[PDB]
Paper text:
The nuclear envelope partitions nuclear components from the cytoskeleton, thereby necessitating their mechanical coupling across the nuclear envelope to enable cytoskeletal function in the structure and positioning of nuclear contents. This is achieved by the Linker of Nucleoskeleton and Cytoskeleton (LINC) complex, which traverses the nuclear envelope and binds to cytoskeletal and nuclear structures to mediate force transduction between these partitioned components (Haque et al., 2006; Crisp et al., 2006; Lee and Burke, 2018; Meinke and Schirmer, 2015). The LINC complex is formed of SUN (Sad1 and UNC84 homology) domain and KASH (Klarsicht, ANC-1, and Syne homology) domain proteins, which interact immediately below the outer nuclear membrane, through complex formation between their C-terminal eponymous SUN and KASH domains. Thus, the LINC complex axis is established by a peri-nuclear SUN-KASH core interaction and mechanically couples the cytoskeleton and nuclear contents. We find that SUN-KASH complexes between SUN proteins and Nesprin-4, KASH5 and Nesprin-1 are 6:6 structures formed of constitutive interactions between two 3:3 complexes.
The SUN1-KASH5 crystal structure was solved at 1.54 Å resolution and revealed a similar 6:6 assembly in which opposing 3:3 complexes are held together by extensive interactions between opposing KASH5 molecules and KASH-lids. SUN1-KASH5 demonstrates the most extensive 6:6 interface in which KASH5 molecules and SUN1 KASH-lids from opposing 3:3 complexes wind around each other in a right-handed screw to create a complete circumferential interface enclosing a hollow core, similar to a β-barrel fold. KASH5 follows an almost linear path, packed between a SUN1 globular core and KASH-lids of opposing SUN1 protomers, with N-terminal 545-PPP-547 motifs of opposing molecules interacting across the interface. KASH5 and KASH4 follow similar paths, with KASH5 PPP-motif interactions and KASH4 zinc-sites located at the same positions and providing analogous interface-spanning interactions. However, an important distinction is that a torsional rotation of approximately 20° between the 3:3 complexes of SUN1-KASH5, relative to SUN1-KASH4, brings together opposing KASH-lids and enables their interaction across the interface. Thus, tip-to-tip interactions via amino acids I673 and F671 of opposing SUN1 KASH-lids contribute to the extensive 6:6 interface of SUN1-KASH5. In contrast, SUN1-KASH5 is an intermediate structure that utilises both KASH and KASH-lid mechanisms to form a fully enclosed 6:6 interface. In agreement with the equal roles of KASH domain and KASH-lid interactions at its 6:6 interface, SUN1-KASH5 exhibited intermediate phenotypes upon I673E and F671E mutation, with retention of complex formation but reduction in oligomer size to species that likely reflect partially dissociating 6:6 complexes. KASH5 functions in meiosis and is essential for fertility.
Residue numbers in the entry:
A (entry chain A), C (entry chain A), E (entry chain A), G (entry chain A), I (entry chain A), K (entry chain A): 615 to 812
B (entry chain B), D (entry chain B), F (entry chain B), H (entry chain B), J (entry chain B), L (entry chain B): 544 to 562
């Protein structure tokens, strides 16, 4: 019934190895440093306000806000997120390889770390689509899902299984609602997983 | 006083980067 | 007396979850990305030397030194610290919310990672104060403490309990001594924890 | 040869950033 | 034979403490933020292609590729690596202190995270040399080794033991082969460990 | 259209940085 | 019949005084430094070629071509002219005051200074119009004229006289032909003269 | 190698400059 | 009584030679390109308004106004002048050599070229002082004068003759009144003439 | 303090400019 | 014997017309704005000193000195000249057209405008050569001359006449001596005149 | 939108320039 010291050490070491591999141990074909990129003309407008002012030698120089690129970068400290106006928005990503998409990951900060006391800005209902080229207006539905505010920070979602699985190198994320924030919605990180084409 | 907004520097790949 | 494999897995997973939440699982109201900021005209002078030279196309371009902003950023690799001259100094931070402060965190690198072989540049005796506005010269004492060079990298400190707990959005960190370095003192990260006002 | 010192780029918030 | 809950908690906590200390618990005298630097005129040419284009306000502005400095920076997400042309190359590093070198670390991404499906760009056979000054053409051999593509992401290598151990502040890494990639070789992180001179 | 290549910003230490 | 030394000195001095007053002694309400400006979205495209390359530290940095702003700047050395593609083009200027326009000036270099041996790029047939606002597509004709390649460098043109003279603060210059250059037309300086409104 | 084209710096007046 | 063709040609050629020598044929020890400079902390504030907006790629980038440096630069087209608020102001200049000052020149545009129809912004009553060092608050009076709005564009003024003529390398120009403009005063060019010290 | 020297911006023509 | 008023006016007007045509009425195939350029790797080193310091927001930013490009730009106010070390130097220019060179112009400031009281920095003995390509070490002599410090500001020099006149698009100016300045020699403007090839 | 004001670039001479 009980475990030995050697067995406990092996369990710990295996868990830290998986943690070190981007928490999941799975390729992220959206990650910017590995070859993913944002298709900027196909994203929602950024939530525009006068919040962050950058100065040099004491005089106002320019305002700063996060761009959609941060959604395909791994830092998820509070504020390292892209914000769009309201509760409906979209983001289009070009992947580092042509793949058969199998699953998607969304991360948000946990409530225990939020400096507003809530994660009401998190996405709630969303869907993912595959696009055959950068000009296609309506892509193929790959799945519809809900990010659970009472679940874990990192949540994974399985793509629909079809008889003929088409390959894609462009994916659209569409947000339909948030967890109640009345001004904006915040996206920390979106990942795309699957099998490369031969 | 007010300054402008820093446009978002944009990044695209003409082919895959080394990995 | 002994634990099962399932119990060991649950202990490991809970420890990694806490580790992933900024090590503490507690909001840091000083963190810059979440809305904290340095009040620059209320900090000590930076330790000024000709150490780091940045070049472009081969010709000297400008010298680099870390600014006080790094004290409210999470990277704590050796050198990712703000240095001030001597062993007395101070830093003033504006918080992301008005709060009742309850505790403070200081981090320094461990001796096992120092490329000088010591952490004599670490802070030793220090105190924390609350300021009602950015022009107030003497704030209210929130506690006096000592960072222990023989303790852990991350150390937490409990604020004084008073009958009437005043709320603050500005905090001063004052360093009174270091662990022996004869030229400067280095600060890696300072955090502020508490309860937001309604 | 010697160059100047890069002034510390400064950051302030007129209101809280999105989180 | 079996372990208690307290014993399991202590094993977990010790493993996370070591993980938090740059995975190894050992000083890295090559790390740039702590005082290491690349001697640029003594590195191989960078693999030069038109891959990454940076724009501002819609118009092509400049191409981006990683520099040899990333080899002495800790982020090892896919693509955060220096690439040189072919399968023979070299990198020269100035260390943060004069030391007796004892060991070296190389990291590469695991195959499970590669967006190409392979780590054929990883280094295979390599050697390390100590240089007495920045103009010396042939340094003293400190060891010859092979990075194992079927081993762990982080691999450590022990320096040769000699009767008279000379101290060095400059080290050359020479790559003799890779794991099969026909165009380039990629280096994620190189570390240098040892005992400082008194 | 094509732009140029961003030269690699270079960093050297005249003496050790504070740690 | 003959003139005295005093009379000759007075003639010389009067001619140099007029020369010193922008050659004409008349206000130019288009001049940029005095408050004129180009309405950029209402000009022809600039003749686009790879001619002038600017470098810094030896590496190509960016191409340079003259903008339409040079047409309302006084330097008329060869090449200090705006070039548009072909032999039909247009330029829209906002004036420094609301005026009743009375006359217009065009300058081109003389043939004796051209490094191609000709002034075939000079404008030939042109017209000038007054616009009531920056969005008006067709303005009021103020005159149609021909720049004479066998005339002087500076040529003046009188506006049409109407019974009700409308005032304008925006003027369009339209070029209908050039003196034979098969690729482009070059404009050195355009001036607008008249009476300010009370 | 080829660089980009220097956009034309543009100048407009919200009110007349001093003369 | 009358002059010959050869005599007239000689008069013309002599007048153009003098014109070509900065109109005066006299060294200007204030001229910036020859070694003069503005002592910026000893000038009046610049007339501050939102007039000239510079853009790049369509978005507001920064406002432009002329600095006091233009007063020691030779272009005097309308608007190439420094403006200060009101009708009292001052400018301090360091000269290219230590000299005995003998005379001063002021230029303003002629009324015939002003796009406002007047030169009411021109200086009227002014004085010039010599300063022994850059920190001296009250210098020695070198003369008090009036710029005549009904005179010529370029006007010269003779310094006071004293029994002991002190040498100076720093000069202050003080304006006491203007020709009526209710918001600002404009300075086009100030020159300083004299004999260098051995 | 001392800064660096502004390199001389260089200008070359791949073909003649319009005149 | 004497001239009429009409005749005097015609003499004045003709002299001002010639003055307005770059003083000479002759094409300058070296002029930068018209298509001339400096071949930078074939010029002498620039006289290097710490003279002119440019600042922004109060802190030293960079030193300024004139480049060889100013020798093919028309402004000749004092200081708008290229300086090289000592009294022997050279400059290589690419012309705007392939020509048969016929004459050369050198300008220097007159002594009456020098803020040092002398033109001892002016060139004295010099020669001009034609080069068939940018790599040719020794070109064909086009003439040897002396700039006269007791002559006029602008001096012209006639090229040697040969039986077979070769055409050139690259010219070297070589200075062999100056008028006595012990540290440097200054060049204000160099021009190249001739007949274009068909 | 509004940008900032371009500070006046300042020029001083540590010794006389060549003339
Ligand atoms: K992120
Ligand atoms: K830090
Ligand atoms: K790295
Ligand atoms: K022009
Ligand atoms: K001026
Ligand atoms: K010049």
């Amino acid at each position: 019934g009980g475990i030995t010291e050697a067995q406990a050490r092996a369990i710990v070491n295996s868990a830290l190895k998986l943690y070190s591999q981007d928490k999941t141990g799975m390729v992220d074909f959206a990650l910017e440093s590995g070859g993913g990129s944002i298709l900027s003309t196909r994203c929602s407008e950024t939530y525009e306000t006068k919040t962050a002012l950058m100065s040099l030698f004491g005089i106002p120089l320019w305002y700063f806000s996060q761009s959609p690129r941060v959604v395909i970068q791994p830092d998820i400290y509070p504020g390292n997120c892209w914000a769009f106006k309201g509760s409906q928005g979209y983001l289009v990503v070009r992947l580092s390889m042509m793949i058969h998409p199998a699953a998607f990951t969304l991360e948000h900060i946990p409530k225990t770390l939020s400096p507003t006391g809530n994660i009401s800005s998190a996405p709630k209902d969303f869907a993912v689509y595959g696009l055959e080229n950068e000009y296609q207006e309506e892509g193929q539905l790959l799945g519809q899902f809900t990010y659970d505010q009472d679940g874990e920070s990192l949540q994974m979602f399985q793509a629909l299984k079809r008889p003929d699985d088409t390959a894609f190198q462009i994916v659209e994320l569409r947000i339909f609602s948030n967890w109640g924030h009345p001004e904006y919605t915040c996206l920390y990180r979106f990942r795309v997983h699957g099998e490369p084409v031969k | 006083s007010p300054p402008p907004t820093w446009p978002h520097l944009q990044l695209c790949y003409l082919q895959p980067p080394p990995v």
